[PDB]
Coordinates of C-alpha atoms and ligand atoms in Angstrom, one line a residue:
Chain S
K1 CA -167.4 139.9 -202.0
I2 CA -170.4 137.8 -203.0
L3 CA -173.1 139.4 -200.9
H4 CA -172.9 142.6 -202.9
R5 CA -173.6 140.8 -206.2
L6 CA -176.7 139.1 -204.8
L7 CA -178.0 142.4 -203.5
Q8 CA -177.6 143.9 -207.0
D9 CA -179.0 140.9 -209.0
Chain P
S1 CA -189.3 156.6 -198.3
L2 CA -192.4 154.7 -199.4
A3 CA -192.4 152.3 -196.4
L4 CA -193.6 155.1 -194.0
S5 CA -196.7 155.8 -196.1
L6 CA -198.0 152.3 -195.9
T7 CA -201.0 151.5 -193.7
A8 CA -200.8 148.8 -191.1
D9 CA -202.6 146.2 -193.2
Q10 CA -200.5 147.3 -196.2
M11 CA -197.5 146.6 -194.1
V12 CA -198.6 143.1 -193.1
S13 CA -199.5 141.8 -196.6
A14 CA -196.3 143.2 -198.0
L15 CA -194.3 141.2 -195.5
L16 CA -196.4 138.0 -195.9
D17 CA -195.9 138.3 -199.7
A18 CA -192.1 138.6 -199.3
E19 CA -191.9 135.3 -197.3
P20 CA -189.1 133.0 -198.5
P21 CA -190.1 129.4 -199.4
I22 CA -189.4 126.4 -197.3
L23 CA -186.4 124.4 -198.7
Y24 CA -185.7 120.7 -198.5
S25 CA -182.6 118.8 -197.4
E26 CA -181.1 115.9 -199.4
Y27 CA -183.2 112.7 -199.8
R28 CA -178.5 107.3 -193.8
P29 CA -178.7 107.6 -189.9
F30 CA -176.5 110.6 -189.3
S31 CA -173.1 111.3 -187.9
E32 CA -171.3 114.4 -186.5
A33 CA -170.0 115.7 -189.9
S34 CA -172.8 114.6 -192.1
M35 CA -175.5 116.3 -190.0
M36 CA -173.6 119.6 -190.0
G37 CA -173.0 119.0 -193.6
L38 CA -176.7 118.9 -194.3
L39 CA -177.5 122.0 -192.3
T40 CA -174.7 123.9 -193.9
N41 CA -175.9 123.0 -197.4
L42 CA -179.4 123.9 -196.3
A43 CA -178.3 127.3 -194.8
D44 CA -176.4 128.2 -198.0
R45 CA -179.4 127.8 -200.2
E46 CA -181.6 129.7 -197.8
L47 CA -179.3 132.7 -197.8
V48 CA -180.0 133.3 -201.4
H49 CA -183.7 133.5 -200.7
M50 CA -183.1 135.6 -197.6
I51 CA -181.5 138.3 -199.6
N52 CA -184.4 138.6 -202.0
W53 CA -186.7 138.6 -199.0
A54 CA -184.6 141.5 -197.5
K55 CA -185.0 143.6 -200.6
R56 CA -188.8 143.3 -200.1
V57 CA -188.8 144.4 -196.5
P58 CA -190.3 147.9 -196.6
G59 CA -187.5 150.5 -195.9
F60 CA -184.6 148.1 -196.5
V61 CA -184.3 149.4 -200.1
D62 CA -183.9 153.0 -199.1
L63 CA -180.6 152.1 -197.3
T64 CA -177.3 152.3 -199.1
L65 CA -175.8 149.1 -200.5
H66 CA -173.2 149.0 -197.7
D67 CA -175.8 149.4 -195.0
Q68 CA -177.8 146.5 -196.5
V69 CA -174.6 144.3 -196.3
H70 CA -174.1 145.3 -192.7
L71 CA -177.6 144.5 -191.4
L72 CA -177.6 141.1 -193.3
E73 CA -174.1 140.2 -192.1
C74 CA -175.1 140.9 -188.5
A75 CA -178.5 139.2 -188.5
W76 CA -178.4 136.3 -190.9
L77 CA -178.2 133.4 -188.4
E78 CA -180.8 135.1 -186.2
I79 CA -183.1 135.2 -189.2
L80 CA -182.5 131.6 -190.0
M81 CA -183.0 130.5 -186.4
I82 CA -186.2 132.4 -185.8
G83 CA -187.3 130.8 -189.0
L84 CA -186.4 127.4 -187.7
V85 CA -188.2 127.8 -184.4
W86 CA -191.3 129.1 -186.1
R87 CA -191.9 126.1 -188.3
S88 CA -190.9 123.8 -185.3
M89 CA -194.0 125.0 -183.3
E90 CA -196.4 122.2 -184.5
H91 CA -193.6 119.7 -183.7
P92 CA -193.1 119.9 -179.9
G93 CA -189.8 118.4 -178.7
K94 CA -188.3 118.6 -182.2
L95 CA -186.7 121.0 -184.7
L96 CA -187.9 121.0 -188.3
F97 CA -184.9 122.2 -190.3
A98 CA -186.7 120.9 -193.4
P99 CA -189.9 119.0 -194.1
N100 CA -187.6 116.0 -194.5
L101 CA -185.2 116.9 -191.8
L102 CA -186.8 116.6 -188.4
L103 CA -184.4 116.3 -185.4
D104 CA -184.7 115.6 -181.7
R105 CA -182.3 115.8 -178.7
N106 CA -181.0 112.3 -179.4
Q107 CA -177.5 112.1 -181.0
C108 CA -176.1 116.6 -182.2
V109 CA -172.3 116.6 -181.9
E110 CA -171.0 118.1 -178.7
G111 CA -172.2 121.3 -177.0
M112 CA -175.0 121.2 -179.5
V113 CA -177.4 120.1 -176.8
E114 CA -177.4 123.5 -175.3
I115 CA -178.2 125.2 -178.6
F116 CA -180.7 122.5 -179.4
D117 CA -182.4 123.0 -176.0
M118 CA -182.3 126.8 -176.4
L119 CA -184.0 126.5 -179.8
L120 CA -186.5 124.1 -178.5
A121 CA -187.4 126.3 -175.6
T122 CA -188.0 129.3 -177.9
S123 CA -190.3 127.2 -180.1
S124 CA -192.3 126.2 -176.9
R125 CA -192.5 129.9 -176.0
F126 CA -194.0 130.7 -179.4
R127 CA -196.4 127.8 -178.9
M128 CA -197.8 128.9 -175.5
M129 CA -198.0 132.5 -176.7
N130 CA -199.9 131.3 -179.8
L131 CA -197.7 133.4 -182.1
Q132 CA -199.5 134.3 -185.3
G133 CA -197.8 134.4 -188.8
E134 CA -198.5 138.1 -189.0
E135 CA -196.7 138.7 -185.8
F136 CA -193.8 136.4 -186.9
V137 CA -193.0 138.3 -190.1
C138 CA -192.9 141.5 -188.1
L139 CA -190.4 140.1 -185.6
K140 CA -188.2 138.8 -188.3
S141 CA -188.0 142.1 -190.1
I142 CA -187.4 143.8 -186.8
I143 CA -184.4 141.5 -186.3
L144 CA -183.2 142.5 -189.8
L145 CA -183.3 146.2 -189.1
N146 CA -182.4 146.3 -185.4
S147 CA -179.5 143.8 -184.9
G148 CA -177.0 146.0 -186.8
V149 CA -178.4 149.4 -186.2
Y150 CA -176.1 150.3 -183.3
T151 CA -173.3 150.4 -185.9
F152 CA -172.8 146.7 -185.0
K153 CA -180.2 155.1 -188.9
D154 CA -182.9 157.6 -188.2
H155 CA -184.7 156.1 -191.2
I156 CA -184.3 152.7 -189.7
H157 CA -185.6 153.8 -186.3
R158 CA -188.6 155.4 -188.1
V159 CA -189.3 152.1 -189.9
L160 CA -188.8 150.2 -186.7
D161 CA -191.5 152.5 -185.1
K162 CA -193.7 151.6 -188.1
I163 CA -193.4 147.8 -187.5
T164 CA -194.1 148.4 -183.8
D165 CA -197.4 150.1 -184.8
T166 CA -198.3 147.2 -187.0
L167 CA -197.9 144.7 -184.1
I168 CA -200.1 146.8 -181.8
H169 CA -202.5 147.1 -184.8
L170 CA -202.5 143.3 -185.0
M171 CA -203.1 142.8 -181.2
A172 CA -205.9 145.3 -181.4
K173 CA -208.3 143.7 -183.9
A174 CA -207.4 140.5 -182.2
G175 CA -209.6 141.7 -179.4
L176 CA -206.8 142.3 -176.9
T177 CA -207.2 145.1 -174.3
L178 CA -204.9 148.0 -174.1
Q179 CA -203.1 146.4 -171.2
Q180 CA -202.8 143.1 -173.0
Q181 CA -201.5 144.9 -176.1
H182 CA -198.4 146.4 -174.6
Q183 CA -197.9 143.3 -172.4
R184 CA -197.8 141.0 -175.5
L185 CA -195.6 143.5 -177.3
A186 CA -193.0 143.3 -174.4
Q187 CA -193.2 139.5 -174.3
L188 CA -192.5 139.2 -178.0
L189 CA -189.6 141.6 -178.1
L190 CA -187.9 140.1 -175.0
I191 CA -187.6 136.8 -176.8
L192 CA -185.5 138.6 -179.4
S193 CA -182.8 138.9 -176.8
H194 CA -182.7 135.2 -176.4
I195 CA -182.6 134.8 -180.2
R196 CA -179.6 137.1 -180.3
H197 CA -178.0 134.9 -177.6
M198 CA -178.5 131.7 -179.6
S199 CA -177.0 133.3 -182.7
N200 CA -173.9 134.3 -180.8
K201 CA -173.5 130.8 -179.4
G202 CA -174.1 129.2 -182.7
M203 CA -171.8 131.6 -184.5
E204 CA -168.8 130.7 -182.3
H205 CA -169.3 127.0 -183.2
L206 CA -169.4 127.7 -187.0
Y207 CA -166.1 129.5 -186.4
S208 CA -165.0 126.3 -184.7
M209 CA -166.3 123.9 -187.4
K210 CA -164.3 126.0 -189.8
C211 CA -161.1 125.4 -187.9
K212 CA -161.9 121.7 -187.8
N213 CA -162.2 121.7 -191.6
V214 CA -164.4 118.5 -191.8
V215 CA -167.6 120.2 -192.7
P216 CA -166.8 122.4 -195.8
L217 CA -168.2 125.9 -195.8
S218 CA -169.4 127.6 -199.0
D219 CA -167.6 130.8 -200.0
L220 CA -170.8 132.8 -199.2
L221 CA -171.1 131.3 -195.7
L222 CA -167.4 132.0 -195.2
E223 CA -167.9 135.7 -195.9
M224 CA -171.0 135.9 -193.7
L225 CA -169.1 134.1 -190.9
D226 CA -165.9 136.3 -191.3
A227 CA -167.9 139.5 -190.8
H228 CA -168.5 138.4 -187.2
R229 CA -164.7 138.6 -186.6
Chain F
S1 CA -196.6 137.1 -153.2
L2 CA -196.0 140.8 -152.4
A3 CA -194.6 141.9 -155.8
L4 CA -197.8 141.0 -157.7
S5 CA -199.8 143.5 -155.6
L6 CA -197.5 146.6 -156.0
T7 CA -199.0 149.6 -157.7
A8 CA -196.9 151.2 -160.4
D9 CA -195.6 153.9 -158.2
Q10 CA -194.8 151.4 -155.4
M11 CA -192.9 149.4 -157.9
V12 CA -190.8 152.4 -158.9
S13 CA -190.3 153.5 -155.3
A14 CA -188.9 150.0 -154.4
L15 CA -186.6 149.7 -157.4
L16 CA -185.3 153.3 -156.8
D17 CA -184.6 152.7 -153.1
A18 CA -182.8 149.4 -153.9
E19 CA -180.2 151.1 -156.2
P20 CA -176.6 150.0 -155.5
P21 CA -174.0 152.8 -154.9
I22 CA -171.4 154.0 -157.4
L23 CA -168.1 152.5 -156.4
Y24 CA -164.7 154.0 -157.1
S25 CA -161.6 152.5 -158.7
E26 CA -157.9 152.9 -157.8
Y27 CA -156.7 154.2 -161.2
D28 CA -153.8 156.4 -159.9
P29 CA -153.1 158.9 -162.7
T30 CA -149.4 158.9 -161.8
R31 CA -149.4 155.2 -162.8
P32 CA -148.6 155.4 -166.6
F33 CA -149.7 152.0 -167.5
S34 CA -151.3 149.6 -169.8
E35 CA -153.9 147.3 -171.3
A36 CA -153.1 144.9 -168.6
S37 CA -153.4 147.5 -165.8
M38 CA -156.7 148.9 -167.1
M39 CA -158.3 145.5 -167.4
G40 CA -156.9 144.7 -164.0
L41 CA -158.7 147.8 -162.6
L42 CA -162.0 146.9 -164.3
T43 CA -161.7 143.4 -162.9
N44 CA -161.3 144.8 -159.3
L45 CA -164.2 147.1 -159.7
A46 CA -166.6 144.5 -161.3
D47 CA -165.7 142.1 -158.4
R48 CA -166.8 144.7 -155.7
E49 CA -169.9 145.6 -157.7
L50 CA -171.0 142.0 -157.8
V51 CA -171.4 142.0 -154.0
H52 CA -173.8 144.9 -154.3
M53 CA -175.6 143.5 -157.3
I54 CA -176.4 140.3 -155.4
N55 CA -177.9 142.3 -152.4
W56 CA -179.7 144.6 -154.9
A57 CA -181.2 141.6 -156.8
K58 CA -182.7 140.5 -153.5
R59 CA -184.7 143.7 -153.3
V60 CA -186.0 143.4 -156.9
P61 CA -189.7 142.6 -156.4
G62 CA -190.3 138.8 -156.9
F63 CA -186.7 137.7 -156.9
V64 CA -186.8 136.1 -153.4
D65 CA -189.9 134.2 -154.3
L66 CA -187.8 132.1 -156.6
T67 CA -185.8 129.0 -155.4
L68 CA -182.2 129.5 -154.5
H69 CA -181.0 127.6 -157.6
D70 CA -183.1 129.8 -159.9
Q71 CA -181.6 133.0 -158.3
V72 CA -178.2 131.6 -159.0
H73 CA -179.0 130.9 -162.6
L74 CA -180.5 134.3 -163.4
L75 CA -177.5 136.1 -161.9
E76 CA -175.0 133.8 -163.6
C77 CA -176.6 134.6 -166.9
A78 CA -177.2 138.3 -166.5
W79 CA -174.4 139.8 -164.3
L80 CA -172.3 141.3 -167.1
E81 CA -175.5 142.6 -168.9
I82 CA -176.5 144.4 -165.6
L83 CA -172.9 145.7 -165.0
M84 CA -172.9 147.0 -168.6
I85 CA -176.3 148.8 -168.6
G86 CA -175.2 150.4 -165.3
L87 CA -172.1 151.6 -167.1
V88 CA -173.8 153.1 -170.1
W89 CA -176.4 154.8 -167.9
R90 CA -173.9 156.7 -165.9
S91 CA -172.0 157.5 -169.1
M92 CA -174.9 159.3 -170.7
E93 CA -173.8 162.9 -170.0
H94 CA -170.2 162.1 -170.9
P95 CA -170.3 162.0 -174.7
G96 CA -167.5 160.0 -176.4
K97 CA -166.4 158.6 -173.0
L98 CA -167.2 155.7 -170.6
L99 CA -167.5 156.4 -166.9
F100 CA -166.5 153.1 -165.4
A101 CA -166.0 154.9 -162.1
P102 CA -166.2 158.6 -161.1
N103 CA -162.4 158.5 -161.1
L104 CA -162.1 156.2 -164.1
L105 CA -163.3 157.9 -167.3
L106 CA -162.0 156.4 -170.6
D107 CA -162.2 157.8 -174.1
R108 CA -161.8 155.8 -177.3
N109 CA -158.1 156.6 -178.1
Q110 CA -156.3 154.0 -175.9
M111 CA -161.6 145.8 -177.6
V112 CA -162.4 149.0 -179.5
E113 CA -165.4 147.1 -180.9
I114 CA -166.8 146.6 -177.4
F115 CA -165.9 150.2 -176.6
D116 CA -167.8 151.5 -179.6
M117 CA -170.8 149.4 -178.9
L118 CA -170.9 150.7 -175.3
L119 CA -170.6 154.2 -176.6
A120 CA -173.4 153.7 -179.2
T121 CA -175.7 152.5 -176.4
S122 CA -175.0 155.4 -174.1
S123 CA -175.6 157.8 -177.0
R124 CA -178.8 156.0 -177.8
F125 CA -179.9 156.4 -174.2
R126 CA -179.1 160.2 -174.3
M127 CA -181.1 160.9 -177.5
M128 CA -184.0 159.1 -176.0
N129 CA -183.5 161.1 -172.8
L130 CA -183.7 157.9 -170.7
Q131 CA -185.2 158.5 -167.2
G132 CA -183.9 157.0 -163.9
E133 CA -187.3 155.4 -163.3
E134 CA -187.1 153.8 -166.7
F135 CA -183.5 152.6 -166.2
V136 CA -184.2 150.7 -163.0
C137 CA -187.2 149.0 -164.7
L138 CA -185.0 147.9 -167.6
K139 CA -182.3 146.6 -165.3
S140 CA -184.8 144.5 -163.4
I141 CA -186.1 143.2 -166.7
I142 CA -182.6 142.0 -167.7
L143 CA -182.2 140.1 -164.4
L144 CA -185.5 138.3 -164.9
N145 CA -185.5 137.8 -168.6
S146 CA -181.9 136.8 -169.5
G147 CA -182.0 133.4 -167.8
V148 CA -185.6 132.5 -168.1
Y149 CA -185.1 130.3 -171.2
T150 CA -182.1 128.4 -169.9
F151 CA -183.2 126.7 -166.7
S152 CA -193.6 120.2 -163.5
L153 CA -191.2 121.8 -161.1
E154 CA -192.4 124.4 -161.6
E155 CA -192.7 128.1 -162.4
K156 CA -191.2 130.8 -164.5
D157 CA -194.9 131.5 -165.0
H158 CA -194.4 133.6 -161.8
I159 CA -191.4 135.3 -163.4
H160 CA -193.4 136.2 -166.5
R161 CA -196.1 137.7 -164.2
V162 CA -193.6 140.0 -162.6
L163 CA -192.1 140.9 -166.0
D164 CA -195.6 141.9 -167.2
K165 CA -195.9 144.0 -164.0
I166 CA -192.7 145.9 -164.9
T167 CA -194.1 146.4 -168.3
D168 CA -197.2 147.9 -166.7
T169 CA -194.9 150.2 -164.7
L170 CA -193.0 151.4 -167.7
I171 CA -196.1 152.3 -169.6
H172 CA -197.5 154.1 -166.5
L173 CA -194.3 156.2 -166.4
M174 CA -194.7 157.2 -170.0
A175 CA -198.4 158.1 -169.5
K176 CA -197.5 160.4 -166.6
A177 CA -194.9 162.1 -168.9
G178 CA -197.6 163.2 -171.3
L179 CA -197.0 160.7 -174.1
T180 CA -199.7 159.6 -176.5
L181 CA -200.7 155.9 -176.7
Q182 CA -198.8 155.5 -179.9
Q183 CA -195.8 157.2 -178.3
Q184 CA -196.0 154.9 -175.3
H185 CA -195.9 151.7 -177.3
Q186 CA -193.2 153.1 -179.6
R187 CA -190.9 154.1 -176.7
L188 CA -191.5 150.8 -175.0
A189 CA -190.4 148.9 -178.1
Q190 CA -187.3 151.1 -178.4
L191 CA -186.3 150.4 -174.9
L192 CA -186.6 146.6 -175.1
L193 CA -184.9 146.4 -178.5
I194 CA -181.8 147.9 -176.9
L195 CA -181.8 145.0 -174.5
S196 CA -180.9 142.9 -177.6
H197 CA -177.7 144.9 -178.1
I198 CA -176.8 144.7 -174.5
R199 CA -177.1 140.9 -174.7
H200 CA -174.8 141.1 -177.8
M201 CA -172.2 143.2 -175.9
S202 CA -172.4 140.9 -172.9
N203 CA -171.7 137.9 -175.1
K204 CA -168.8 139.5 -176.9
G205 CA -167.4 140.7 -173.6
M206 CA -167.6 137.3 -172.1
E207 CA -165.5 135.9 -174.9
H208 CA -162.6 138.4 -174.2
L209 CA -162.9 137.6 -170.5
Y210 CA -162.5 133.9 -171.3
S211 CA -159.4 134.7 -173.4
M212 CA -158.0 136.8 -170.6
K213 CA -158.4 134.0 -168.2
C214 CA -156.5 131.3 -170.2
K215 CA -153.7 133.7 -171.0
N216 CA -153.2 134.1 -167.3
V217 CA -151.8 137.6 -167.2
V218 CA -154.9 139.5 -165.8
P219 CA -156.1 137.5 -162.7
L220 CA -159.8 137.1 -162.1
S221 CA -161.3 136.9 -158.6
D222 CA -162.8 133.7 -157.3
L223 CA -166.3 135.0 -157.7
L224 CA -165.7 136.3 -161.3
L225 CA -164.1 133.0 -162.2
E226 CA -167.2 131.1 -161.0
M227 CA -169.4 133.5 -163.0
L228 CA -167.2 132.9 -166.1
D229 CA -167.5 129.1 -166.0
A230 CA -171.3 129.5 -166.1
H231 CA -171.1 130.7 -169.7
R232 CA -169.2 127.5 -170.8
Chain B
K1 CA -170.6 128.1 -155.2
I2 CA -169.7 131.6 -153.8
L3 CA -172.8 133.1 -155.5
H4 CA -175.1 130.6 -153.8
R5 CA -173.5 131.4 -150.4
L6 CA -174.0 135.1 -150.7
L7 CA -177.5 134.7 -151.8
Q8 CA -178.3 133.3 -148.4
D9 CA -177.3 135.9 -146.0
Ligands
LIG1 O1 -183.1 127.2 -191.4 C1 -181.8 127.0 -190.7 C2 -181.7 127.4 -189.4 C3 -180.5 127.2 -188.7 C4 -179.5 126.7 -189.3 C5 -178.2 126.4 -188.5 C6 -178.3 126.2 -187.2 C7 -177.1 126.0 -186.3 C8 -175.9 126.7 -186.3 C9 -174.8 126.5 -185.5 C10 -174.9 125.5 -184.5 C11 -176.1 124.7 -184.4 N1 -176.2 123.7 -183.4 C12 -177.1 122.6 -183.6 C13 -176.8 121.5 -184.3 C14 -177.7 120.5 -184.5 C15 -178.9 120.5 -183.9 F1 -179.8 119.6 -184.1 C16 -179.3 121.7 -183.1 C17 -178.4 122.7 -183.0 C18 -177.2 124.9 -185.3 C19 -176.9 126.4 -189.3 C20 -176.1 125.2 -189.4 C21 -174.9 125.2 -190.2 C22 -174.5 126.3 -190.8 O2 -173.3 126.3 -191.6 C23 -175.3 127.6 -190.8 C24 -176.4 127.6 -190.0 C25 -179.6 126.3 -190.7 C26 -180.8 126.5 -191.3
LIG2 O1 -169.3 148.5 -164.1 C1 -168.6 147.7 -164.9 C2 -169.0 147.6 -166.2 C3 -168.3 146.8 -167.1 C4 -167.3 146.2 -166.6 C5 -166.5 145.3 -167.6 C6 -166.5 145.6 -168.9 C7 -165.8 144.8 -170.0 C8 -165.8 143.4 -170.0 C9 -165.1 142.8 -171.0 C10 -164.4 143.5 -172.0 C11 -164.4 144.8 -172.0 N1 -163.7 145.5 -173.0 C12 -163.5 146.9 -172.8 C13 -162.4 147.4 -172.0 C14 -162.2 148.8 -171.9 C15 -163.1 149.6 -172.6 F1 -162.9 150.8 -172.5 C16 -164.1 149.0 -173.4 C17 -164.3 147.7 -173.5 C18 -165.1 145.5 -171.0 C19 -165.6 144.2 -167.0 C20 -164.2 144.3 -167.1 C21 -163.4 143.3 -166.6 C22 -163.9 142.3 -165.9 O2 -163.2 141.3 -165.4 C23 -165.4 142.2 -165.8 C24 -166.1 143.1 -166.3 C25 -166.9 146.3 -165.3 C26 -167.6 147.1 -164.5

């Protein structure tokens, strides 16, 4: 899901 | 575990520095769909900044990735809303979604009057309490850490205790008596119950707007919304 | 006003003496039944509790100083919150279970989200070692705070003054328990933050109750129906 | 309103 990526970037 | 070592002042400045910027809406006299369209677009862009703000909330980093996702998924509309009511203080009777998006009770679609009125009432409450920016960033982070903590953890409660200390440390130094300190603390935290309520009410309508399929939701908003069902 | 001139101990004494009783359900273990039956039982119970809640609310210091319409509003907004905090309070020493009634004790394995949130709250209360004196203060805070932003003519100013008084009482209790000033403020914040979860649970529970109504299989009483229309 | 009635004895 998107949220994960934003919390890693 | 670095958040616990911070002083009270070190806690304040760290939160002030993490503050997300104020975004603008697009540059017509508004209809049901187009108004929710603008807010939706606005909310989607704000979410990206909220996440980077979340990372910079002392203690939020120490959590696992999955626990970060949970707290944000539970609290995102609350955080937006308390943001909305904070910048609406100097505009009594109105809601400042953006510096170019100032709204009043006059139409809202349907059933929006109650959420409009609830938001407006919160703003007035902040006004008569003379809520300071230091106090505000504390409340917002508290919302971030508390709203999902009841599985819907010991570290989080320790950090929550820390933010409490900061608030009291802010009311002391503001010249408040010991009695005025815990009284103001209570007053501030009780408003958080109302902010939770407004989120819940607002959430059910976004779920409704989705089923209407007139105001298109972004894939990110869809995920944040889905997590409440 | 009388409430504004109560000492902390007098406040506690009044709230304690005003406590409603713990009512029983019908249950009947021999009855094997269902999701319909259980919700039917809880509906019966809640309906009888509401009559005591109303007469209890009258004895909460300051409540009768409000207009009749304001009393109606505060109860319409807070009734399920109040029922639920009563539930989790009496469920404290029953880990992993909810004591809806002394003869109605439910565990998880039989709405699971609402169940789990109620469990989490009761467990939270147990770790904190919540005291009876602190409980009755919180419950009164719910009655006065939940509808104060949803109501010239005139006050609410008065409501806030009584709320502040209850805050004073809470802190007084923590002082007598041997807590430091830092501990007092921290405990206070912890107690009030839980009121946010209780609002959340009430909201989610209200949604199901509204589903239940429209799918007319579990019948609501006339009073519970009127309380349900309030959260339109 | 039932609630209103009950609130006045
Ligand atoms: O900074 C923001 C604060 C709140 C909001 C929202 C506030 C919101 C949410 C649901 C219902 C309502 N009702 C409403 C509508 C118009 C008004 F003028 C007042 C309330 C608002 C929101 C709107 C759409 C969306 O997809 C996500 C968030 C957006 C940005
Ligand atoms: O003392 C009480 C505390 C709570 C309740 C209720 C709690 C409640 C409300 C809505 C949903 C759920 N879900 C649920 C059911 C069983 C469980 F074990 C857990 C959650 C409960 C309730 C149930 C039915 C009703 O008509 C009114 C109030 C009743 C009495």
